[PDB]
């Protein structure tokens, strides 16, 4: 906390200048360490100010007003720093009360495809910088993949659902600006096998712990062992998990082998000893007869006859010495074998029941990545890890849509308008859209720049749902192809009554087969109403899309009965089922790092497109086609705050281009 808290809650190192800061302040960062601290302080302090009160615009005046000497002594610096921050949506983004009502006439004109959060976020900024902004949206509502089901008092999201921690999350600021009811999610998650019975704490804990052990293992294969290509194909996470489980099975056997191999080594030292013992009890038997016969010769006897008795006597006790030392040895081994035979190593690596619960953990992962682990990149699936927010995940109790809708306020949004063609050239762009309702009723939009926020599922369609004229450069279309666009679905169950443990937010269900680990594997209790929400992940996700709503809600009830009793589970009053892969304005749910891709492709996605010149030999043009969206933010893919940020990013980059960058001197 302090000014350093701000830096952090703004995703920036508090005592270092960033790459994007060096870009606009090369004079400072290439200069003396003393000025850098002033910069960093002015930056951090302005942030704090904006953050402490994100409901009202923060102006250059108000900023200098609240600064101290020696910091408020140089006012060009303060002005640059403040201008920079404003431009890149670090201060004054979202929904604030503007002090200086909007500058009367606008400069430049931007068409924005899609009113997802990335669109909306960018739109607002552009408008704030005084540009002419218009959004084209194919749907009859805003918010795209932030969808929210409403009916009566029932409220459930079919899209984004969780705020993944406020620590550094832009959505932290947005929630102070907008009434979202933010409820903590309690970490506890009971599983329930196919039969209907809790997996017991002993197992529950030892399968999980193996799961986590198994992830770390794959990471070790990747980074330390370099196991990343396999017959030219790049290795997936799925493959790697198999290769690790195999090597764990192999070693389980490897152990058994050398354990029994120790029994035969010892059970066979025994054999050789008993052979020696049977052969001694033999010579003893016979030597006794001899000595017996020598004592039958009654006295008086001569000396050799006396010697004989005496000799055979010694000879016999000597051989009774040995067969006594051997019974000693025999006694050692004989027990050193009840040793080994009593503490056997592990029977199996994981049983069928075990392996089935591990599958639910993999379902968890296939849900988190919205895809079959066989599609994820081993090296990179978790490349976005360092940037995780801190603090408890939350849900939006009043429904997530509440946020798009808030942001859409004051904006030129054309709903039911499906872009079909984007035409960009050295002098400008036209966008050709149609009316989704009567699809021959055509529209044309002329602008300085297009911000494209099409979902990557959309950008992938073959054959194309949107045509680029001219076609996008191969570097971009290869990024589109390489990248992964997964799928994940929701079933909403609306009841007259809570029949579940009200103090539990989520409870798993374990499938029967690997093939179906995804199917209704998880259930959420989040809302004020009695709604229950069930995920359909992994391979199951895509196959369940081709199945009727009834059948789905069937298997849902089935499972719940199993867990709760065949008559605590009423008929559901209202039910909904998401089908994201089939939804033509999404074509999927969110992106993942596919095998063969990397985080760098996300950067390729965000790079703007610059047309060739009109008259050949004319100067290099301005860039015209820009990109935002969840698939374009390397450090925050697949999320709301991620899209939001990418929106801010482009808004800045467009304004720098068309309204010019006064602050860089």
């Amino acid at each position: 906390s302090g000014v350093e808290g701000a830096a952090f809650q703004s995703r920036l190192p508090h005592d270092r200048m960033t790459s994007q800061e060096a870009a606009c302040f090369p004079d400072i960062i290439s200069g003396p360490q003393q000025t850098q601290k002033v910069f960093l302080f002015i930056r951090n302090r302005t942030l704090q100010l904006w953050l402490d009160n994100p409901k009202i615009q923060l102006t250059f005046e108000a900023t200098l007003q609240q600064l101290e000497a020696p910091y408020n002594s140089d006012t060009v610096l303060v002005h640059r720093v403040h201008s920079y921050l404003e431009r890149h949506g670090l201060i004054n983004f979202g929904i604030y009360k503007r002090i200086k009502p909007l500058p009367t006439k606008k400069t430049g004109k931007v068409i924005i495809i899609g009113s997802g959060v990335s669109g909306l976020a960018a739109a607002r900024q552009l408008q704030s910088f005084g540009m002419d902004v218009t959004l084209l949206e194919a749907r009859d509502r805003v918010g795209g993949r932030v969808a929210t089901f409403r009916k009566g008092n029932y409220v459930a999201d079919l899209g984004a659902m969780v705020v993944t921690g406020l620590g550094g999350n832009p959505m932290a600021v947005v929630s102070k600006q907008v009434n979202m009811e933010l409820a903590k999610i309690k970490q506890k998650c009971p599983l329930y096998e196919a039969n209907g019975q809790a997996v017991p704490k002993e197992k529950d804990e030892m399968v999980e712990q193996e799961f986590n052990r198994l992830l770390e293992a794959t990471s070790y294969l990747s980074h330390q062992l370099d196991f990343n290509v396999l017959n030219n194909k790049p290795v997936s996470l799925g493959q790697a998990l198999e290769v690790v489980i195999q090597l764990q099975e192999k070693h389980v056997k490897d152990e058994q082998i050398e354990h029994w191999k120790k029994i035969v080594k010892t059970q066979e030292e025994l054999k050789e000893l008993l052979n020696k013992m049977v052969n001694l009890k033999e010579k003893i038997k016979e030597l006794h007869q001899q000595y017996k016969e020598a004592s039958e010769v009654k006295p008086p006897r001569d000396i050799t006859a006396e010697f004989l008795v005496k000799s055979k006597h010694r000879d016999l006790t000597a051989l009774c010495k040995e067969y006594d030392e051997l019974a000693e040895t025999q006694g050692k081994l004989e027990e050193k074998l009840q040793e080994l035979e009593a503490n056997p190593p592990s029977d199996v690596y994981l049983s069928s029941r075990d392996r089935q619960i591990l599958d639910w953990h993999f379902a968890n992962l296939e849900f988190a990545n919205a895809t079959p682990l066989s599609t994820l990149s081993l090296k990179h699936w978790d490349q976005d890890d360092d940037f995780e927010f801190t603090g408890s995940h939350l849900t939006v109790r009043n429904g997530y849509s509440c946020v798009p809708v808030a942001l859409a306020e004051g904006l030129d949004i054309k709903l039911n308008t499906a872009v079909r063609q984007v035409r960009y050239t050295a002098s400008g762009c036209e966008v050709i859209a149609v009316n989704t309702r009567s699809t021959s009723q055509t529209f044309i939009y002329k602008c300085d720049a297009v911000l494209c926020t099409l979902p990557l599922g959309v950008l992938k369609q073959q054959p194309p749902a949107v045509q680029f004229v001219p076609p996008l450069p191969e570097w971009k279309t290869s990024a589109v192809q390489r990248m992964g666009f997964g799928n994940l679905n929701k079933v909403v169950l609306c009841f007259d009554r809570v029949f579940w443990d009200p103090s539990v937010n989520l409870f798993g269900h374990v499938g029967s087969t690997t093939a179906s680990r995804g199917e209704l594997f998880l259930f959420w209790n989040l809302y004020k109403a009695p709604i229950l929400l069930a995920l359909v992940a992994g391979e199951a996700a895509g196959i369940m899309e081709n199945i009727s709503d009834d059948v789905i809600v069937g298997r849902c009830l089935a499972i719940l009965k199993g867990i709760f009793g065949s008559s605590a589970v009423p008929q559901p009053k209202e039910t909904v089922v998401s089908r994201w892969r089939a939804d033509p304005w999404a074509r999927g749910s969110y992106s993942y790092v596919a095998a063969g891709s990397s985080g760098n492709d996300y950067d390729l996605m965000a790079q703007p497109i610059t047309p060739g010149p009109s008259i050949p030999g004319a100067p290099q043009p301005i860039p015209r086609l820009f990109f935002a969206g969840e698939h374009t933010i390397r450090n925050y893919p697949a999320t709301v705050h991620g899209a939001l940020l990418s929106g801010l990013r482009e808004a800045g980059r467009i304004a720098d281009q068309f309204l010019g960058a006064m602050y860089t001197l």
């Binding site: 970490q187 998650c189 986590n212 988190a368 990545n369 699936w381 978790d382 976005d384 890890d385 993942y592």
Partner: peptide, 9 residues
């Protein structure tokens, strides 16, 4: 991505 995982350690 990872952060969406239920039951984090």
């Amino acid at each position: 991505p990872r952060s969406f995982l239920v039951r984090k350690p």
